[PDB]
Amino acid sequence: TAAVAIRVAKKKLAKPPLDLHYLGDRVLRQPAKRVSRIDDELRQTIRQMLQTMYSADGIGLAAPQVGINKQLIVIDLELPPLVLINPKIERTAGDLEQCQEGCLSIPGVYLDVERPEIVEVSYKDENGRPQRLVADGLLARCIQHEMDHLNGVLFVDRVENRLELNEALDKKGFAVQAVRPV
Q: Cα separation of 143 and 62, whole Å?
A: 10
Among 103, 113, 121, 143, binds Zn ion (CB under 5 A): 103
97 as an active site residue: the answer is no
Site for ligand BB2 in 29-68 (CB under 6 A): 58-62, 65
- CB-CB contact of 123 with 37 (8 Å): no
Q: Does 87 bind ligand BB2 (CB under 6 A)?
A: no
Q: Which does 139 bind (CB under 5 to 8 A by kind): ligand BB2, Br ion, Zn ion, none?
A: none
Task: Considering only the stretches 61-69, 114-122, 157-165, 173-181, report the one whose residues sit in contact with Br ion under the rule CB under 5 A.
Answer: 173-181
Q: Which of 146, 160, 164, 167 does the annotation list as catalytic? A: 146
In the complex, minimum distance from the CB of residue 104 to ligand BB2, in angstroms, rounded to a whole number? 4
Residue of 144, 34, 143 lying closest to 86 (CA atoms): 34
Q: Max CA-CA distance within the chain? A: 53
DSSP state of 178: G
10 versus 22: smaller Cβ distance to Zn ion: 22
117 versus 157: smaller Cβ distance to Br ion: 157
Residue nearest to ligand BB2 according to CB distances in the complex = 102
Distant-in-sequence contacts of 92-95, Cβ < 8 A, 24+ apart? 92/116, 92/118, 92/119, 92/120, 92/144, 93/117, 93/118, 93/119, 93/120, 94/118, 94/136
CA-CA-CA-CA torsion for 111, 173, 31, 95, nearest 10 degrees? 0
**Catalytic residue numbers?**
146
- Residues in touch with ligand BB2 (CB under 6 A): 58-62, 65, 100-105, 138, 141-142, 145-146, 149
